[PDB]
Amino acid sequence: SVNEVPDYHEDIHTYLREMEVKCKPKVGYMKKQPDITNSMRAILVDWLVEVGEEYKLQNETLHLAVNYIDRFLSSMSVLRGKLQLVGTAAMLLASKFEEIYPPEVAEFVYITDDTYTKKQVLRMEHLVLKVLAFDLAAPTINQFLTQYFLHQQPANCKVESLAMFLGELSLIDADPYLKYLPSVIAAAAFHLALYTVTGQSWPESLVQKTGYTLETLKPCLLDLHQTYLRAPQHAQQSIREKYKNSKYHGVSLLNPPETLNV
Amino acid sequence: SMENFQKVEKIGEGTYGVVYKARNKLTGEVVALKKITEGVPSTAIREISLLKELNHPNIVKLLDVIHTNNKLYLVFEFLHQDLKKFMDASALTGIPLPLIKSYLFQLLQGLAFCHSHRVLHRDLKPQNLLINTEGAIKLADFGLARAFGVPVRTYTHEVVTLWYRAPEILLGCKYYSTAVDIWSLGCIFAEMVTRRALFPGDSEIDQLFRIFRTLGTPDEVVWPGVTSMPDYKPSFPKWARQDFSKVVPPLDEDGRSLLSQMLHYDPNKRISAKAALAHPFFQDVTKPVPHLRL
Ligand SMILES: Cc1ncc(-c2ccnc(Nc3ccc(S(C)(=O)=O)cc3)n2)n1C(C)C
């Protein structure tokens, strides 16, 4: 269908592969932040997940906002009392980029419980645009996932939802997931979802599209499997809650496989 | 910042803001400056973020963004006029066919590059297609553009200036894609030949009926799924499809073939910009300068 852009999907994929390397956050940044930690970031991202539920935002919007925050924090030292202001301005920018109907700024002030003023949010918006040099069209896990889903034989809604869920879980933990590119996390999430639901594996057609094999995907895959196995006990639960919904075929209620048999 | 720019004159104006011609005092470069609540508007965020990625000879170049507490200036390479002005200035000459062909070829290159980079333009009217004195034509005003995913996801409905809007938008389809932009360029190709808008409707229903009167009212055979579309009405008059040679009489056989593939009802069958580049209409394409002073 033209909805799958047959004449452009390969150009687009190549382009996104090229951009994900250029838009890549600094793997080591959190060590160099004097005041914030991986756990404060996990809290912010989980809060953004809820904000997205409350305002019925697209998953793509969430992923974009996390990309902005990570890129921002890669050069800008931020105190803990200001982390949520960065995150709010990021979600605002992501909404204006990606949503048909972004929430208004007042709504973004209101969900911080008036921790910050409208003026602070708008000043932060401009700072984030300046630091990112307006480079907002970033590739996400989601953009690779939707292309990978076209290789299913045939389409399985539980596989799709579960792959999204796993991609989303990766956003919460900077360690380990800052070290993996979006295309790779999506590939691991897709393989893992497909295997959990159908018993099948990363297809040969996606080896041809991406150049990735279960061998190149193994490190990410081991990380993701652990994250999946431990998800019920993680301090942050908003993604598990969200993916209970029938919108996502209740996939967070599925049991992870005990082993991968790689 | 602005100390190096000397404004020359106003050239343009819509909701986005205002555009001036200006000059860089140090380099001599002539530019267009576009000067721009809920903070930075989404149209400017989209325009700037998308244009930073799109460097191509048939896409207007964004040179700089000057970002102040108070104001935002976008600095573009200067082009002399829009295609609308040029069509009017060519009133009783017509536009020579080598120029029409060159313009369409360039527009298709610019568009294919947009689509290859996951950007839908969504407002390809002649006012957004800019020409210079060297024979170039370029896509401009990416305020209404969007970065798409593969496959596409529901986006803003009722997009595209009405005369240039594709039937799948007019009929309210849940999804639309790259084919919307090809529909517009098809309308533009016709218009370069006649100097008159092909489908000058005044409402959505009148736009549809004008389309139907020229191309036939579509049915399941020509366009599967059409009778199930959200705004399709089984009461729609049934007009016969009218010989393409009557649609744009001066067009030869190759021209007629390409126009018909750009104005195909089924967005699945409509030609892509990339494939159109190889159409036999362009066998002899060159890049002449425009025949009039700009
Ligand atoms: C909205 C916008 N953003 C940037 C431009 C833009 C960029 C570069 N060059 C020009 N030059 C120009 C435009 C129109 C005319 S006209 C109406 O007098 O024929 C004459 C010169 N414009 N634009 C255009 C589309 C106004």
Coordinates of C-alpha atoms and ligand atoms in Angstrom, one line a residue:
Chain A
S1 CA 0.0 0.0 0.0
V2 CA 1.3 3.7 -0.4
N3 CA 0.6 3.8 3.4
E4 CA 3.8 1.6 3.7
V5 CA 5.7 3.8 1.2
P6 CA 7.0 1.0 -1.1
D7 CA 9.0 3.4 -3.2
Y8 CA 10.8 5.1 -0.2
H9 CA 10.9 2.6 2.8
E10 CA 14.5 1.5 2.1
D11 CA 15.7 5.1 1.6
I12 CA 13.9 6.1 4.8
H13 CA 15.4 3.1 6.8
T14 CA 19.0 4.0 5.6
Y15 CA 18.4 7.6 6.5
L16 CA 17.1 6.8 10.0
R17 CA 20.2 4.5 10.5
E18 CA 22.4 7.4 9.5
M19 CA 20.5 9.9 11.8
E20 CA 20.4 7.6 14.9
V21 CA 24.3 7.7 15.0
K22 CA 24.3 11.5 14.7
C23 CA 21.4 12.1 17.3
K24 CA 23.1 9.7 19.8
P25 CA 23.4 10.7 23.5
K26 CA 26.7 10.5 25.3
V27 CA 26.8 7.0 26.9
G28 CA 28.8 8.1 29.9
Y29 CA 26.9 11.4 30.8
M30 CA 25.3 10.4 34.0
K31 CA 28.7 9.8 35.7
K32 CA 29.4 13.5 34.9
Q33 CA 26.2 14.9 36.3
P34 CA 27.0 16.1 39.8
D35 CA 23.5 15.9 41.2
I36 CA 21.3 13.5 39.3
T37 CA 21.4 9.7 38.9
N38 CA 20.1 7.0 36.8
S39 CA 17.3 6.5 39.4
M40 CA 16.2 10.2 39.3
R41 CA 16.0 9.8 35.5
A42 CA 14.0 6.6 35.9
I43 CA 11.5 8.5 38.0
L44 CA 11.2 11.4 35.4
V45 CA 10.7 9.0 32.5
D46 CA 8.1 7.0 34.4
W47 CA 6.4 10.3 35.2
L48 CA 6.4 11.2 31.4
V49 CA 4.7 7.9 30.7
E50 CA 1.9 8.9 33.0
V51 CA 1.7 12.3 31.5
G52 CA 1.4 10.7 28.1
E53 CA -1.5 8.5 29.4
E54 CA -3.3 11.4 31.1
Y55 CA -3.2 13.5 27.9
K56 CA -3.6 10.6 25.5
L57 CA -0.3 11.3 23.7
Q58 CA 1.3 9.1 21.1
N59 CA 4.0 6.7 22.1
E60 CA 6.2 8.4 19.5
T61 CA 5.9 11.6 21.5
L62 CA 7.2 9.9 24.6
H63 CA 10.2 8.4 22.8
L64 CA 11.0 11.8 21.2
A65 CA 10.9 13.5 24.6
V66 CA 13.3 11.0 26.1
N67 CA 15.7 11.5 23.2
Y68 CA 15.6 15.2 23.8
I69 CA 16.2 14.9 27.5
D70 CA 19.2 12.5 27.1
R71 CA 20.8 14.7 24.4
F72 CA 20.2 17.7 26.6
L73 CA 21.7 16.0 29.7
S74 CA 24.7 14.9 27.6
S75 CA 26.0 18.5 27.6
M76 CA 24.1 20.3 30.3
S77 CA 24.6 19.8 34.0
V78 CA 21.2 19.9 35.7
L79 CA 20.3 20.1 39.5
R80 CA 17.6 17.7 40.7
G81 CA 15.1 20.4 41.5
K82 CA 15.2 21.3 37.7
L83 CA 15.2 17.9 36.1
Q84 CA 11.4 17.9 35.8
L85 CA 11.5 21.3 34.2
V86 CA 13.8 19.9 31.5
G87 CA 11.5 16.9 31.1
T88 CA 8.4 19.1 30.9
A89 CA 9.9 21.4 28.2
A90 CA 11.0 18.3 26.4
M91 CA 7.5 16.7 26.4
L92 CA 6.0 20.1 25.3
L93 CA 8.4 20.2 22.3
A94 CA 7.8 16.6 21.4
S95 CA 4.1 17.2 21.5
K96 CA 4.3 20.3 19.3
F97 CA 6.4 18.3 16.8
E98 CA 4.5 15.0 16.8
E99 CA 0.8 15.6 18.0
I100 CA -2.2 16.7 16.0
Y101 CA -3.4 18.5 19.2
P102 CA -0.6 19.2 21.6
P103 CA -1.6 20.0 25.2
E104 CA -1.3 23.7 26.0
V105 CA 1.4 25.1 28.1
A106 CA -1.0 25.6 31.0
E107 CA -1.6 21.9 31.0
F108 CA 2.1 21.2 31.2
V109 CA 2.4 23.7 34.2
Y110 CA -0.6 22.0 35.9
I111 CA 0.9 18.5 35.8
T112 CA 4.1 19.7 37.5
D113 CA 1.6 20.8 40.4
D114 CA 2.8 24.4 39.9
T115 CA 6.4 23.5 40.8
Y116 CA 7.4 25.8 37.9
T117 CA 5.7 28.8 36.3
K118 CA 4.6 29.2 32.6
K119 CA 7.5 31.6 32.1
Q120 CA 10.0 29.0 33.4
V121 CA 8.6 26.3 31.1
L122 CA 8.8 28.6 28.1
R123 CA 12.3 29.8 28.9
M124 CA 13.4 26.1 29.3
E125 CA 11.7 25.3 25.9
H126 CA 13.9 27.9 24.3
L127 CA 17.0 26.6 26.1
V128 CA 16.3 23.0 25.0
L129 CA 15.8 24.2 21.3
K130 CA 19.1 26.1 21.6
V131 CA 21.1 23.2 23.0
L132 CA 19.6 20.7 20.4
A133 CA 19.9 23.4 17.7
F134 CA 16.3 22.7 16.8
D135 CA 17.3 19.1 15.8
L136 CA 14.0 17.5 16.8
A137 CA 13.3 15.0 14.1
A138 CA 15.1 12.2 15.8
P139 CA 14.8 8.5 15.1
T140 CA 13.2 6.5 17.8
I141 CA 12.8 2.8 18.7
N142 CA 9.3 3.1 17.4
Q143 CA 10.1 4.3 14.0
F144 CA 12.2 1.1 13.5
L145 CA 9.6 -1.1 15.1
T146 CA 6.8 -0.2 12.8
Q147 CA 9.0 -1.0 9.8
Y148 CA 10.1 -4.3 11.4
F149 CA 6.4 -5.2 12.0
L150 CA 5.8 -5.3 8.2
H151 CA 7.9 -8.5 8.1
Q152 CA 5.5 -10.5 10.2
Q153 CA 4.1 -13.7 8.8
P154 CA 1.2 -12.7 9.2
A155 CA 0.6 -9.7 11.4
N156 CA 0.1 -10.4 15.1
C157 CA -1.2 -7.7 17.3
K158 CA 0.1 -9.2 20.5
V159 CA 3.7 -9.3 19.0
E160 CA 3.4 -5.7 18.0
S161 CA 2.1 -4.5 21.3
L162 CA 4.6 -6.6 23.3
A163 CA 7.5 -5.3 21.2
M164 CA 6.3 -1.7 22.0
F165 CA 6.1 -2.5 25.6
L166 CA 9.6 -3.8 25.8
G167 CA 11.0 -0.9 23.7
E168 CA 9.3 1.4 26.2
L169 CA 10.7 -0.3 29.2
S170 CA 14.2 0.4 27.8
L171 CA 13.6 4.1 28.1
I172 CA 13.5 4.0 31.9
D173 CA 17.0 2.6 32.6
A174 CA 19.9 4.6 31.2
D175 CA 22.1 1.8 32.4
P176 CA 22.2 -0.3 30.2
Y177 CA 20.1 1.1 27.4
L178 CA 22.0 4.3 26.6
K179 CA 24.6 2.2 25.0
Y180 CA 22.3 0.7 22.4
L181 CA 21.0 2.5 19.3
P182 CA 17.3 2.7 18.6
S183 CA 17.4 0.3 15.7
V184 CA 19.1 -2.4 17.9
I185 CA 16.8 -2.1 20.9
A186 CA 13.8 -2.3 18.4
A187 CA 15.4 -5.4 16.9
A188 CA 15.9 -7.1 20.2
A189 CA 12.4 -6.1 21.3
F190 CA 10.9 -7.4 18.1
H191 CA 12.8 -10.7 18.4
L192 CA 11.9 -11.1 22.1
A193 CA 8.2 -10.3 21.5
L194 CA 7.9 -12.6 18.5
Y195 CA 9.6 -15.5 20.5
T196 CA 7.5 -14.9 23.7
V197 CA 4.2 -14.9 21.7
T198 CA 4.7 -17.3 18.7
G199 CA 7.9 -19.2 19.4
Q200 CA 9.4 -17.7 16.2
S201 CA 12.8 -15.8 15.7
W202 CA 14.2 -12.8 14.1
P203 CA 13.4 -13.4 10.5
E204 CA 15.8 -13.8 7.6
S205 CA 14.0 -10.9 5.7
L206 CA 15.1 -8.5 8.6
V207 CA 18.6 -9.8 8.5
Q208 CA 18.5 -8.7 4.8
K209 CA 16.9 -5.3 5.7
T210 CA 19.0 -4.4 8.7
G211 CA 22.2 -6.5 8.6
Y212 CA 21.6 -7.5 12.2
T213 CA 21.7 -11.2 13.2
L214 CA 20.8 -12.8 16.6
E215 CA 24.5 -12.8 17.0
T216 CA 24.9 -9.0 16.7
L217 CA 21.6 -8.6 18.8
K218 CA 22.8 -10.8 21.6
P219 CA 24.1 -8.3 24.1
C220 CA 21.0 -6.1 23.8
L221 CA 18.8 -9.2 23.9
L222 CA 20.3 -10.4 27.2
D223 CA 19.8 -7.0 28.8
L224 CA 16.2 -6.8 27.5
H225 CA 15.3 -10.3 28.7
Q226 CA 16.5 -9.5 32.2
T227 CA 14.6 -6.2 32.1
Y228 CA 11.5 -8.1 31.0
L229 CA 12.0 -10.8 33.8
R230 CA 12.4 -8.2 36.5
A231 CA 9.7 -5.8 35.3
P232 CA 7.2 -6.8 37.9
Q233 CA 9.7 -5.9 40.7
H234 CA 11.0 -2.6 39.1
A235 CA 10.5 0.6 41.3
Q236 CA 8.9 2.2 38.2
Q237 CA 5.6 0.6 37.1
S238 CA 3.8 3.1 34.8
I239 CA 4.6 1.2 31.6
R240 CA 3.4 -2.1 33.1
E241 CA 0.2 -0.3 34.1
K242 CA -0.3 1.2 30.7
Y243 CA 0.3 -2.0 28.8
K244 CA -2.4 -3.8 30.8
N245 CA -4.9 -1.9 28.7
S246 CA -6.8 -3.6 25.9
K247 CA -5.5 -0.8 23.6
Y248 CA -2.2 -2.8 23.9
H249 CA -3.9 -6.2 24.1
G250 CA -3.0 -6.6 27.8
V251 CA 0.6 -7.6 26.8
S252 CA 2.2 -6.6 30.2
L253 CA 0.2 -9.5 31.7
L254 CA 2.0 -12.1 29.5
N255 CA 4.6 -14.2 31.1
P256 CA 8.2 -13.7 29.9
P257 CA 9.9 -16.9 28.6
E258 CA 12.3 -18.3 31.2
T259 CA 15.1 -18.8 28.6
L260 CA 15.9 -17.7 25.0
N261 CA 17.8 -20.7 23.7
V262 CA 20.3 -18.7 21.7
Chain B
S1 CA 22.5 38.2 14.6
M2 CA 20.7 41.0 12.7
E3 CA 23.5 43.6 12.7
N4 CA 24.9 42.0 9.5
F5 CA 21.5 42.1 7.6
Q6 CA 20.1 45.1 5.7
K7 CA 16.4 44.8 4.9
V8 CA 15.4 45.7 1.3
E9 CA 11.6 45.2 1.0
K10 CA 8.7 43.1 2.1
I11 CA 8.1 40.1 -0.2
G12 CA 5.4 38.0 1.5
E13 CA 2.9 37.5 4.3
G14 CA 0.5 34.9 5.8
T15 CA -0.4 33.7 9.4
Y16 CA 3.2 32.4 9.8
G17 CA 4.5 36.0 9.9
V18 CA 6.2 38.2 7.3
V19 CA 9.1 37.7 4.9
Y20 CA 11.6 40.3 3.8
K21 CA 14.2 40.5 1.2
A22 CA 17.6 41.4 2.7
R23 CA 21.4 41.4 2.2
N24 CA 24.3 40.2 4.3
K25 CA 26.6 43.3 4.5
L26 CA 29.8 41.3 4.9
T27 CA 29.4 38.6 2.2
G28 CA 26.9 40.3 -0.1
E29 CA 24.5 37.3 0.1
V30 CA 20.9 38.2 -0.7
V31 CA 18.5 36.4 1.7
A32 CA 14.9 36.1 2.7
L33 CA 14.3 36.8 6.4
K34 CA 11.1 35.4 8.0
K35 CA 10.3 37.0 11.3
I36 CA 8.1 35.0 13.9
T37 CA 1.3 32.6 23.7
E38 CA 2.2 28.9 23.7
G39 CA 5.9 29.6 23.1
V40 CA 7.5 28.7 19.8
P41 CA 4.8 27.7 17.4
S42 CA 4.6 24.0 16.2
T43 CA 4.7 25.2 12.5
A44 CA 8.0 26.9 13.1
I45 CA 9.4 23.9 15.1
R46 CA 8.4 21.7 12.2
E47 CA 9.7 24.1 9.5
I48 CA 13.1 24.6 11.2
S49 CA 13.7 20.9 12.3
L50 CA 12.7 19.5 8.9
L51 CA 14.5 22.0 6.8
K52 CA 17.8 21.5 8.8
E53 CA 17.8 17.9 7.4
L54 CA 16.7 18.8 3.8
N55 CA 19.6 20.0 1.7
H56 CA 18.8 19.7 -2.0
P57 CA 19.1 22.0 -4.9
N58 CA 15.2 22.0 -5.3
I59 CA 14.4 22.7 -1.7
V60 CA 14.7 26.2 -0.3
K61 CA 17.8 26.5 1.9
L62 CA 17.5 27.5 5.4
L63 CA 20.8 29.3 6.1
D64 CA 20.4 30.3 9.7
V65 CA 18.0 30.7 12.7
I66 CA 18.4 33.7 14.9
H67 CA 16.8 32.9 18.1
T68 CA 16.2 35.8 20.6
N69 CA 14.2 36.1 23.8
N70 CA 11.6 38.2 21.9
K71 CA 11.7 36.9 18.2
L72 CA 12.8 34.2 15.9
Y73 CA 14.3 35.0 12.4
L74 CA 14.7 32.3 9.8
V75 CA 17.3 33.2 7.1
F76 CA 16.8 31.5 3.7
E77 CA 18.6 31.8 0.4
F78 CA 16.7 34.4 -1.7
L79 CA 14.5 33.3 -4.6
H80 CA 13.1 36.0 -6.9
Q81 CA 9.4 35.1 -7.2
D82 CA 6.7 32.5 -6.8
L83 CA 5.4 30.3 -9.6
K84 CA 2.0 32.1 -9.3
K85 CA 3.5 35.4 -10.2
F86 CA 5.3 33.9 -13.1
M87 CA 2.2 32.2 -14.5
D88 CA 0.4 35.6 -14.4
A89 CA 3.4 37.4 -16.0
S90 CA 3.2 34.8 -18.8
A91 CA -0.5 35.5 -19.5
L92 CA -0.6 35.7 -23.3
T93 CA 2.7 34.1 -24.2
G94 CA 2.1 30.9 -22.2
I95 CA 5.2 29.3 -20.5
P96 CA 7.4 27.6 -23.0
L97 CA 7.2 23.9 -22.8
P98 CA 11.0 23.4 -22.1
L99 CA 10.5 25.5 -19.0
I100 CA 7.3 23.7 -17.9
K101 CA 9.1 20.4 -18.3
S102 CA 12.2 21.6 -16.4
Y103 CA 10.1 23.0 -13.6
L104 CA 8.1 19.8 -13.2
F105 CA 11.3 17.7 -13.3
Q106 CA 12.9 19.8 -10.6
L107 CA 9.8 19.8 -8.5
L108 CA 9.7 16.0 -8.7
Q109 CA 13.4 15.9 -7.6
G110 CA 12.7 18.1 -4.6
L111 CA 9.6 16.1 -3.7
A112 CA 11.3 12.7 -4.0
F113 CA 14.0 13.9 -1.7
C114 CA 11.4 15.0 0.8
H115 CA 9.8 11.6 0.7
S116 CA 13.1 9.8 0.9
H117 CA 13.7 11.7 4.1
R118 CA 10.3 10.9 5.6
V119 CA 8.8 14.4 5.1
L120 CA 5.3 15.2 3.6
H121 CA 5.1 18.7 2.4
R122 CA 1.3 19.1 2.4
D123 CA 1.0 22.5 0.9
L124 CA 2.3 22.4 -2.6
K125 CA 0.5 25.4 -4.2
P126 CA 2.2 27.7 -6.7
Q127 CA 2.7 30.4 -4.0
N128 CA 5.1 27.9 -2.2
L129 CA 7.2 27.0 -5.3
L130 CA 9.9 29.6 -5.8
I131 CA 11.9 30.4 -9.0
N132 CA 15.2 32.3 -9.5
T133 CA 16.8 33.9 -12.6
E134 CA 19.0 30.9 -13.3
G135 CA 16.1 28.4 -14.1
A136 CA 15.8 26.7 -10.7
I137 CA 12.6 26.1 -9.0
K138 CA 12.4 25.1 -5.3
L139 CA 10.0 23.9 -2.7
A140 CA 9.4 26.4 0.1
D141 CA 7.3 26.9 3.3
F142 CA 7.6 23.8 5.3
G143 CA 5.4 25.2 8.1
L144 CA 2.6 22.7 7.2
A145 CA 5.0 19.7 6.7
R146 CA 5.3 16.7 8.8
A147 CA 7.8 13.9 9.5
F148 CA 6.1 10.6 8.8
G149 CA 6.5 7.1 10.0
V150 CA 6.5 3.8 8.0
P151 CA 3.7 2.8 7.8
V152 CA 1.9 6.2 8.2
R153 CA -0.2 6.9 11.3
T154 CA -3.3 9.1 11.4
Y155 CA -2.2 12.8 10.9
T156 CA -4.0 16.1 10.7
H157 CA -7.0 15.8 8.4
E158 CA -8.3 18.3 5.7
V159 CA -4.7 19.3 4.9
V160 CA -3.4 21.0 1.7
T161 CA -4.8 24.2 0.3
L162 CA -8.2 23.2 -1.1
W163 CA -7.6 23.5 -4.9
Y164 CA -4.6 21.2 -4.5
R165 CA -6.1 18.7 -2.0
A166 CA -6.2 15.0 -2.9
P167 CA -9.4 13.0 -3.0
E168 CA -8.3 10.7 -0.2
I169 CA -8.1 13.8 2.1
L170 CA -11.5 15.2 0.8
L171 CA -13.1 11.8 1.5
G172 CA -11.8 11.6 5.0
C173 CA -9.6 8.4 4.7
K174 CA -8.1 7.4 8.1
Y175 CA -4.6 7.5 6.4
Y176 CA -2.9 9.5 3.7
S177 CA 0.7 9.4 2.6
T178 CA 3.2 10.6 -0.1
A179 CA 0.6 10.4 -2.8
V180 CA -1.1 13.6 -1.5
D181 CA 1.9 15.6 -2.6
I182 CA 2.0 14.0 -6.0
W183 CA -1.8 14.9 -6.5
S184 CA -0.8 18.5 -5.8
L185 CA 2.0 18.5 -8.3
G186 CA -0.3 17.1 -10.8
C187 CA -2.6 20.0 -10.3
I188 CA 0.4 22.2 -10.7
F189 CA 1.6 20.6 -13.9
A190 CA -1.9 21.3 -15.5
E191 CA -1.8 24.8 -14.2
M192 CA 1.6 25.5 -15.7
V193 CA 0.2 24.5 -19.1
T194 CA -3.1 26.4 -18.9
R195 CA -2.2 29.1 -16.4
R196 CA -5.5 28.3 -14.6
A197 CA -6.1 26.2 -11.6
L198 CA -7.3 22.8 -12.6
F199 CA -9.8 22.2 -9.7
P200 CA -10.8 25.6 -8.3
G201 CA -13.4 24.5 -5.8
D202 CA -15.0 26.7 -3.0
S203 CA -15.8 24.0 -0.5
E204 CA -15.0 20.4 0.0
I205 CA -18.0 19.1 -1.8
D206 CA -17.6 21.5 -4.7
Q207 CA -13.9 20.5 -4.9
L208 CA -14.9 16.8 -5.1
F209 CA -17.5 17.5 -7.7
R210 CA -15.1 19.4 -9.8
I211 CA -12.6 16.5 -9.6
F212 CA -15.4 14.0 -10.4
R213 CA -16.4 16.1 -13.4
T214 CA -13.0 15.9 -14.9
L215 CA -11.8 12.4 -14.0
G216 CA -15.2 10.6 -13.6
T217 CA -17.0 9.8 -10.4
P218 CA -14.8 7.0 -8.9
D219 CA -16.3 3.5 -8.3
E220 CA -15.1 0.3 -6.7
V221 CA -13.6 -0.8 -10.0
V222 CA -11.4 2.3 -10.5
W223 CA -10.8 2.7 -6.7
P224 CA -11.4 -0.2 -4.4
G225 CA -12.7 0.8 -1.0
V226 CA -13.9 4.3 -2.3
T227 CA -17.6 3.6 -1.5
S228 CA -16.8 2.7 2.1
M229 CA -14.7 5.9 2.8
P230 CA -15.9 8.1 5.7
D231 CA -17.2 11.0 3.6
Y232 CA -18.2 9.1 0.5
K233 CA -22.0 9.4 -0.1
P234 CA -23.9 7.0 -2.3
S235 CA -25.9 10.1 -3.6
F236 CA -22.8 11.5 -5.3
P237 CA -23.6 12.2 -9.0
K238 CA -22.1 9.8 -11.4
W239 CA -20.1 11.7 -14.0
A240 CA -18.3 9.9 -16.9
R241 CA -14.6 10.2 -17.0
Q242 CA -13.4 12.7 -19.6
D243 CA -10.7 11.9 -22.1
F244 CA -7.5 13.3 -20.8
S245 CA -6.7 15.0 -24.0
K246 CA -9.7 17.3 -23.2
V247 CA -8.4 18.0 -19.7
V248 CA -5.2 19.8 -20.9
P249 CA -5.6 20.1 -24.7
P250 CA -2.1 21.5 -25.5
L251 CA -0.3 18.5 -23.8
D252 CA 1.2 15.9 -26.1
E253 CA 1.0 12.2 -25.6
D254 CA 3.8 11.8 -23.0
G255 CA 2.6 14.8 -21.0
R256 CA -0.9 13.3 -20.9
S257 CA 0.4 10.0 -19.8
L258 CA 2.4 11.5 -16.9
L259 CA -0.5 13.8 -15.8
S260 CA -2.9 10.9 -15.7
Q261 CA -0.6 8.9 -13.5
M262 CA -0.1 11.8 -11.1
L263 CA -3.9 12.3 -10.9
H264 CA -4.9 8.7 -10.5
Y265 CA -7.7 8.2 -8.0
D266 CA -6.3 5.2 -6.1
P267 CA -3.4 6.6 -4.0
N268 CA -1.8 3.1 -4.3
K269 CA -1.6 3.4 -8.1
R270 CA -0.7 7.0 -8.3
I271 CA 2.9 7.5 -9.5
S272 CA 5.8 8.3 -7.0
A273 CA 8.0 11.3 -7.5
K274 CA 11.0 8.9 -7.8
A275 CA 9.4 6.9 -10.6
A276 CA 8.1 10.0 -12.4
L277 CA 11.7 11.2 -12.9
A278 CA 12.1 8.4 -15.5
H279 CA 8.9 9.1 -17.4
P280 CA 9.5 9.6 -21.2
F281 CA 8.0 13.1 -20.9
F282 CA 11.5 14.1 -19.5
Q283 CA 13.5 12.4 -22.3
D284 CA 14.6 15.8 -23.6
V285 CA 14.5 17.8 -20.4
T286 CA 17.0 20.7 -20.0
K287 CA 17.3 23.6 -17.6
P288 CA 16.7 26.9 -19.4
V289 CA 16.5 30.3 -17.6
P290 CA 13.0 31.8 -17.5
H291 CA 12.0 33.7 -20.6
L292 CA 11.0 36.9 -18.7
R293 CA 12.8 39.2 -16.4
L294 CA 12.1 38.3 -12.7
Ligands
LIG1 C1 6.8 31.8 3.5 C2 8.2 31.8 3.0 N1 9.2 31.3 3.7 C3 10.4 31.7 3.0 C4 10.0 32.1 1.8 C5 11.0 32.6 0.8 C6 12.3 32.1 0.8 C7 13.1 32.5 -0.2 N2 12.8 33.4 -1.1 C8 11.5 33.9 -1.0 N3 11.3 34.8 -2.0 C9 10.1 35.3 -2.5 C10 8.9 34.8 -2.2 C11 7.7 35.3 -2.8 C12 7.8 36.3 -3.7 S1 6.4 37.0 -4.4 C13 5.0 36.6 -3.3 O1 6.5 38.4 -4.3 O2 6.2 36.4 -5.7 C14 9.0 36.9 -4.0 C15 10.2 36.4 -3.4 N4 10.6 33.5 -0.1 N5 8.6 32.2 1.8 C16 7.8 32.5 0.6 C17 7.0 31.3 0.2 C18 7.0 33.8 0.8

